[PDB]
Amino acid sequence: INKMNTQFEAVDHEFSNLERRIGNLNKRMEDGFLDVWTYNAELLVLLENERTLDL
Amino acid sequence: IKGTYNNTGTQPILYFWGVHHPLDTTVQDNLYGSGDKYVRMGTESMNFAKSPEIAARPAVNGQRSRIDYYWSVLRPGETLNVESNGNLIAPWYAYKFVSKKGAVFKSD
Amino acid sequence: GERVERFEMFPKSTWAGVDTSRGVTNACPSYTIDSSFYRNLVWIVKTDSATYPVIKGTYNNTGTQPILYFWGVHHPLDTTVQDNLYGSGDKYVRMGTESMNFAKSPEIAARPAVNGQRSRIDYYWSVLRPGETLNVESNGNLIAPWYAYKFVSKKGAVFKSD
Amino acid sequence: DCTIEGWILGNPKCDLLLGDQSWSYIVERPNAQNGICYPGVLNELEELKAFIGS
């Protein structure tokens, strides 16, 4: 819980009609960070439960 | 017409103004005088100058004219000068502003 | 973009009092002739009579498809070229919608020659939303829209490869 | 009932927010109808919203 307390802050600013590219960049960055954090947390949970029951 | 405002305090000043674009030369010559018009504004770091662009746009809320709105932030110690020969929407009220990081939510 | 439908928005018979056929140049050739122009834009030129009368156009949106459209402003190299292709006096090219505002003035300058042309044409584009009306007005130097694209979208990308 | 545009511009139908105010976050309803009354374009509106959020 200590090493996971670091929060990644992200808010969706308004993007205009001519800011499709910046909007797509924001979306891709936030989605990639979400995928990374979700994968890390889930696989850590699995491996930790494994080695805990083994212990 | 000319105007000026000095900044004495320590609060930034968010302010707004606008330029009116009629639909006919008749509307322009009726609301304002004749000749070349302009709306210019300056600060220690801001420079703005807009000329009237008369065109008959589609009607929105019964208006075929337009008003382009612009905004700026006068920094503490910064002076603002405004000059116009016509088509000027003049600032009347502004906001002294002190900031700290936040966000905006679009929900019901 | 998922699907497009090319249509004609402002026909050549919309601009009154101006010559609609002279809008060709050797810099934009086809495979048959040497002097042509874009199949979607019209280079409006003066008739025998001078002064380039004020031209207006409009288009209403009835359907449910957004309309990608293009236009342009011509900048000659001399006041001679401007006074020859268009009338005399202050020119302008202005356009408006429910959300778009455009206004360009002629900026005559002798640029370096590209494809035998020392003049320029600034191209601009926009997307008329469903239910949005478009108005166009000009006293000269206008490249008028002729064909536009009704457009229905879904996320995709573009690849630069051989 | 309004947008940020009509709020800081001073649409006469959004005068409940007024004078000296303070907050931590701002809520904007989606189906509002009191925005820009006289038609026009508010330049750098997205940057204005971002600067107002702070």
Structure tokens at A48: 């930790």
Taking chain B, what is the end-to-end CA distance rounded to the nearest angstrom? 44
Are the CB atoms for B96 and B62 separated by under 8 Å?
no
Distance between C133 CA and the closest CA of chain D, angstroms: 14
Please tell me which chains touch A, using 3 or more CB pairs under 8 Å as the contact test: B, D
Please check whether residue C108 is in contact with residue C77, taking contact to mean a CB–CB distance below 8 angstroms.
yes
Q: Which residues contact A18 (CB under 8 A, 6 or more apart)?
A: none
Q: Which of B14, B68, B104, B107 to mutate to probe the D interface, most D CBs <10 Å?
A: B104
Q: Tell me the chain B residues in contact with residue C56 when contact means C-beta distances shorter than 8 Å.
A: 56
Give B28's contacts (C-beta < 8 A, 6+ positions apart).
Answer: B22, B37, B52, B54, B86, B87
Q: Beta strands of chain C (E only): which ranges?
A: 3-8, 41-43, 55-59, 67-75, 93-96, 101-104, 120-128, 134-138, 142-145, 147-152
Reduced to 3 states (helix: H, G, I; strand: E, B; else coil), residue D47 is: helix
Per the DSSP assignment, residues forming a β-bridge with C103 are: C94
CA distances (Å), B98 to each of B44, C46, C99, in order? 20, 58, 32
The helix or strand, by DSSP H or E, that contains position B68, with its residue range, turns out to be strand B66-74
Instruction: Using CB atoms, pick whichever of D23, D31, D39 lies closest to residue B60.
Output: D39
* Residues of chain B contacting D10 with CB distance shorter than 8 Å: 93
Region for residue C72 given its phi and psi (left: phi exceeds 0; alpha: psi -120 to 50; beta: otherwise): beta
Amino acid occupying residue B88? L
- The answer to whether B74 and B80 are in contact (CB under 8 A) is yes
- Six token digits for residue C26: 């050797």
Residue range of the domain that includes C136: 1-162
Domain count, chain C: 1
Sequence-distant (6+) residues with CB within 8 A of C24 are C35, C36, C37, C43
Cβ neighbours of C151 (radius 10 Å): 16
Residue B4, classed as helix, strand or coil, is: strand
Q: What is the total residue count of chain D?
A: 54
Residue pair C44/C23 in contact by the 8 Å Cβ criterion: yes
Beta pairing partners, C135: C58, C96
* Cβ separation D49–A13 shorter than 8 A: yes
User: Residue A14: its chain B contacts at CB < 8 A?
Assistant: 104
Contact assessment for residue B101 and residue B18, using Cβ atoms and an 8 Å cutoff? no
Q: Which residue of C has its CA nearest to D42?
A: C99
- Per CB-CB distance under 8 Å, the chain D contacts of B66 are 38-41
Give the chain D residue whose CA is nearest to the CA of C102: D41
| CA–CA distance, C73 with A5 (Å, rounded to integer) | 56
How far is residue B4's CA from residue B74's CA, in Å, rounded to a whole number?
12
Q: How far is CA A48 from the centre of its chain?
A: 20
Cβ-based contacts of B14 with chain D (< 8 Å): 8
User: Measured between alpha carbons, how far is B32 from B40 in angstroms, rounded to an integer?
Assistant: 16
- Specify burial of residue A36 (Cβ count, 10 A radius: 0-12, 13-18, 19+): exposed
Nearest to C105 by CA among C129, C134, C82, C135: C82
Which experimental approach was used here?
Answer: X-ray
b (16+ CB within 10 A) / e for B12-35: bbbbbbbbbbbbeeebbeeebeee
Token couple for C160: 């630069």
Tell me how far apart the 2 most distant CA atoms of chain D are, in Å. 31
Q: Could C132 and B57 be called an inter-chain contact, meaning their C-beta atoms sit closer than 8 Å?
A: no
- The C-alpha of C51 sits at a distance from chain D's nearest C-alpha, in angstroms, of 31
**Is any Cβ of chain D less than 8 angstroms from the Cβ of A17?**
no
Chain C contact for D43, CB < 8 A?
A: no
In angstroms, what separates the C-alpha of A41 from chain B's closest C-alpha? 27
Residues 6+ apart with CB under 8 A from C116: C26, C27
What's the CA gap between B35 and B38, in Å, rounded?
10
Rounded CA-CA distance A2/B54 in Å is: 63
> Given the DSSP bridges, would you call strands B104-106 and D26-28 parallel, antiparallel or unpaired?
parallel
> B84: number of CA atoms within 13 Å, CB side?
22
**Quoted resolution (Å):** 3.5
**Helix (H, G, I), strand (E, B), or coil: what is residue A22?**
helix
Q: What is the DSSP letter of C14?
A: G
Closest by CA position to B51, among listed B68, B65, B63: B68
Judge: D45–A14 Cβ closer than 8 Å, yes or no.
yes
Contacts of B103 in chain A (CB under 8 A): 11
DSSP tag of A18: T
Residues in chain C: 162
Q: How many CB atoms lie within 10 A of CB A46?
A: 10
